[PDB]
Amino acid sequence: IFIYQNNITPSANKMIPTVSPAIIETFQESDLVVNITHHELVPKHIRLSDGEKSQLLQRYKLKESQLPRIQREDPVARYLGLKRGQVVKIIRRSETSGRYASYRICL
DNA sequence: CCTTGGCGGTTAAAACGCGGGGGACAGCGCGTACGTGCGTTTAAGCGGTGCTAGAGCTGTCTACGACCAATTGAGCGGCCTCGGCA
Q1: Which of A38, A41, A57, A82 could pair with A77 in a Cys bridge, judged by C-beta atoms 3.0 to 4.6 Å apart?
Q2: Boundaries of each RNA polymerase subunit H/Rpb5 C-terminal domain copy (predicted)?
Q3: Residue A51 DSSP label
């Protein structure tokens, strides 16, 4: 996890995916002053394991490409270091049923 | 929502000042072997007929290989067949 101070030049931004299978995640120091997951409007995200994911897809008989999506640069996906193909489970408050579990898959 | 007018951001290296430290430029000392103007005597050099002929200069003659014109054969590229490595 690489925290920088002011900016990251676009030329230097191409040096990040060239260092695989190790993963590098960059963050601007401003963006971390507040932990956004403590906000009222952000419900608790929990990444599903590979076994739980497979069990989920069979229950709904669905292709991976049919789930709702979250972009990789989304703030909560970056916070969790989500990689392509991984699913988050989102349990959020509902005024009609009380509790409701929503699933999203990361692009 | 998309593509130009001028503007930061994008590298290999030199715009090298300038800190360090020494190879080596030009003047100066000494110092020796070689070095030309003048001197001698010479052996070849410049200019003249005398003699004798080789082949250039210029002339016309006789002549054999190329020009541009119709034939036509071999090398090469595009189809088309044959064949063993994967």
Answers
A1: A82
A2: 34-106
A3: H
